[model samples]
Target chain A: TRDQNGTWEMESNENFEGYMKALDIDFATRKIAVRLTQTLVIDQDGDNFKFKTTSTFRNYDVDFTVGVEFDEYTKSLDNRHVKALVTWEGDVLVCVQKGEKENRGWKKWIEGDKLYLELTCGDQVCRQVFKKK
Target chain B: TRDQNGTWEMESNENFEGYMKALDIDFATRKIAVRLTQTLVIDQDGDNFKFKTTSTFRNYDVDFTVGVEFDEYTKSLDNRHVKALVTWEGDVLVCVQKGEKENRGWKKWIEGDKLYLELTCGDQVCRQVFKKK
Candidate 1:
């Protein structure tokens, strides 16, 4: 399995605007999110995981177990409801969100001391790179 | 003595960009944050309190007791260090943050069914109104 136990700080984000737009977020909120630094805190225990995303303006926390589907609510960003499940595709932790929007999901992987995240909504995908702290 | 429990969703935000600038948040992150619909979750038991700010992009969780000082490290957003103390100003839950920035603090209160949050940094203040759910 992937060792994703510490804090990770955002290094760069690619195509974030497109992903936000795909989620139908308004202009004002997108402007503030693009500039703020984000931190990700992850705690993994066997099949159970806790993911916490932290920023200045808002925060999101997700709790899940691998191979189990659960109801996921996107409260602050898109205000959508979905069924999410995490499964290991080889070493990468892949999450698929089945919701109102098509092709919504995220993937988490580790490369060296860096963490990679790819967020997908419809056809838009945003790539975020984070360095372990 | 105040009881701040249950869920509150963001309704209106005033001068949020100015507050972001005062915290020295960058252009990209600020863009995303300004448009987000934030939810505040508070769990209070006597003097102990658990404050949670939730959004799709990120989440912030803080635990404290009234009149007790604690070290607060803002991980994302501005990434600052502050000594925070929460106190009750009548029915209002007021927090004073002493840090590198000038005049940094926040206040929370409820009027009728609405919840109010005022975030302060330097000379900037952002007021957010939330509706209880």
Candidate 2:
């Protein structure tokens, strides 16, 4: 499995606007979010996962045991309730979210010194690349 | 006046649990949040301010014009509506949040390469320090 530990700073975000729109994020929020650089901190211990994404405008923190489905209430983002499950597919961590929206999921993998994240909502897929710092 | 620009990473958080509980955050959410290292990105242009607090589990973004009272809806943290005002007290950016809770406010200041934040809810105060990156 890919080792996803330490701090990762966002290098690029692709199609973020489309993904944010799919989540029904308002214009004002999206405006500043697009310009902000995001940092991700991931701590993995066996099947346990702790993820923290920090920025000046918003901060998100989640801790979960892999393979166990849990209720995920996206507090500031979308404010939606979903059943989320994370599983390892090969060396990648794939998250499947069952919720009101269709095809809402995310995939995470590591390559070289970079972490790749793909967020999908509806037909919109946002790809984000972060460099290990 | 302090120029609160650039990225700041959390170094220490004091009495965060008390502040979290004062906001009535659940046990599970508080557990992960206490250990998470947060990053703050601030974009300031004269009186206009944009703040982004990003983490993996939850994120918060707020934008307002300084010295002007604005309606702030705390989406994830506390999940309450408040009339917030930001003003410069010497070199410090002091925020006063008038809402359902008493003594709810925050103050931000820059000391060398460090950013200091103090979050207050009721009588509980959470002091957080962030190092500039």
DockQ of each: 0.06, 0.05
Worst window of 10 by summed lDDT in candidate 1 chain A = A1-10
Question: Candidate 1: where is the Cα deviation over 4 Å?
Answer: A1-30, A34-133, B1-55
Chain A (alone) TM-scores for all candidate structures:
0.58, 0.59
Each model's TM-score, in the order given? 0.36, 0.36
DockQ of 2: 0.05
* Model 2, residue A76: C-alpha shift (Å): 22
Give the Å shift of residue B48 in candidate 1. 51
**CA lDDT, candidate 2, residue B93:** 70
Q: Could you give candidate 2's per-residue lDDT for residues B89-128 as a string of tens digits?
A: 7777788999767777877565665555566765456555
CA lDDT, candidate 2, residue B65? 52
Docking class of 1: incorrect
Report iRMS values in order.
Answer: 20.8, 21.7
